[PDB]
Structures are given as structure tokens and as C-alpha cells.
Ligand binder design. Structure first.
Ligand SMILES: CC(=O)c1cccc(CC(=O)N2CCC[C@H]2C(=O)Nc2cccc(Br)n2)c1
Length: 217
């Protein structure tokens, strides 16, 4: 997160760190007891998911790491494209739920969020252009852009004027009126430059796919 603030410990109880050989790689969103949604290129052998966390290193009563049982990228995702950039991860067991670990409802109705609406993006991605990795969760509020300024029906844009998502925030949520609307893209892009808006996959565009994966296993 660039130009943001430190999040309040555990106030975003859906927030997941998606980790690869022990280190944070991507954000994620607890959407059911045993399913975290992230982005497709968050994949590249040993994948895990930390729930209930504010600090990645420090001891917290709610922190729980989990093994991943199944990794389901969207079938139409490609390693070199930003389309269909979703990934579902089934956890090893169902998450121990509490005030600090709670699934986030996702938008099932396929209407765009109103342009100008500020939505909340949280993550452990880089906080500057030198690559600094924060210990504790960060967030920033970002105004949503109309479709034509964005320029897919399946993607949505947010302003990137200093305040922005960046490397390592990929796969984490964009939240608007307490509902998940967006998942941060996992393709490379310049951050912090108002002329290159943030890109987030509209989850409502993929209600059929998600369900069809959350039916099973
Ligand atoms: C969303 C966006 O603005 C943006 C910009 C540039 C780059 C990216 C891509 C991105 O992040 N990834 C690609 C898949 C792995 C993940 C990553 O590289 N994870 C990571 C690496 C080092 C430190 C940290 Br913390 N995380 C997104």
C-alpha cells in the first residue's frame, strides 16, 4: 500500500496473507470457512495462508497459519494477462472463526460501484518505491473510476494519485460499503502515478465461477 495508513489490528478480519516458502507474497480474502480468494499469478510448491494477523512476525492470540489443500485458478487465466485473475485456495481445515477471523460477503449482483465511491484496499505489499515490506497490515481508501476512464466489463479501476495498491497487495480486497467488490490485480503495473489507475477484478462478474468452486470440496 502506498500513501496509506496502518490498519487497526484485526479490524479487517477477512484479510489473509498468502505465503510462499514462509514469506508473504499476496493478499487474500476469506470468503468462506475453508476458502480464501486471491489472484491467479500469486502462484508461480509450498503455499500457506495466515489468517487473524496484523503483524506478520509478532505473536497475536488470533494468528493462525494454514496449509492449502487445493489451488483453483480461474480456467481462463493466463500467466501473461490480467484477465480472469482470480484464484481460490481451499484451506487444510475450516478456519477457526472469531472477531478477528471472519469471511467477507462478496458482491453477487452485477452492478458497477458508483464512480467517486471510496473503497478500502488493505495489504502487506510494498509501502514505497524502494521495495520496503511492512510488518503490519496497511490500508488506503481509493476512489472508483468510471468504466470509460478505466479504458473490461470484468475489471474496475481506482484512482492511483500517490495513494495506491502495489506489489504484494495483489490478491487482496477492495471493499465498498462493507462488501467485497474487487480483488487486486497480480500483474505488474506502475504504482502511485495518477495517470496509471489501479486495476481490480470485479468479483461480481465471476459469481458463477466462484460458486461452482465453492459447491465442491
Ligand atoms: C498490484 C500492483 O500494483 C502490482 C505492482 C507490481 C507488481 C505486482 C505483482 C506482484 O506483486 N506479484 C506477482 C505475483 C507475486 C506478487 C509479488 O511480487 N509479491 C511480492 C513480491 C515482493 C514483495 C512483496 Br510485499 N510481495 C503487482
Amino acid at each position: 500500500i502506498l500513501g496509506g495508513r496502518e490498519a487497526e489490528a484485526h479490524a479487517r478480519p477477512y484479510m489473509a496473507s498468502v505465503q510462499l516458502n514462509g514469506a508473504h507474497l499476496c493478499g487474500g480474502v476469506l470468503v468462506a470457512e475453508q476458502w480464501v480468494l486471491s489472484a491467479a499469478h500469486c502462484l508461480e510448491g509450498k503455499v500457506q495462508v495466515l489468517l487473524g494477523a496484523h503483524s506478520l512476525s509478532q505473536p497475536e492470540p488470533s494468528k493462525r497459519l494454514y496449509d492449502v489443500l487445493r489451488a483453483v485458478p480461474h480456467p481462463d487465466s493466463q500467466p501473461d494477462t490480467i484477465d480472469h485473475d482470480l484464484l481460490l485456495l481451499q484451506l487444510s481445515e475450516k478456519a477457526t472463526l472469531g472477531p478477528a477471523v471472519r469471511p467477507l460477503p462478496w458482491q453477487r449482483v452485477d452492478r458497477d460501484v458508483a464512480p467517486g465511491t471510496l473503497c478500502d484496499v488493505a495489504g502487506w505489499g510494498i509501502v514505497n518505491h524502494a521495495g520496503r515490506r511492512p510488518d503490519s497490515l496497511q490500508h488506503v481508501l481509493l476512489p472508483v473510476l468510471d468504466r470509460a476512464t478505466c479504458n473490461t466489463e470484468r475489471l474496475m479501476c481506482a484512482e492511483s494519485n500517490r495513494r495506491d495498491s502495489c506489489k504484494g497487495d495483489s490478491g487482496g480486497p477492495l471493499v465498498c460499503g462493507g462488501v467485497l467488490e474487487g480483488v487486486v490485480t497480480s500483474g505488474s503495473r506502475v504504482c502511485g502515478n495518477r495517470k496509471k489507475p489501479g486495476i481490480y477484478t470485479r468479483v461480481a462478474s465471476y459469481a458463477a465461477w466462484i460458486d461452482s468452486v465453492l459447491a465442491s470440496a
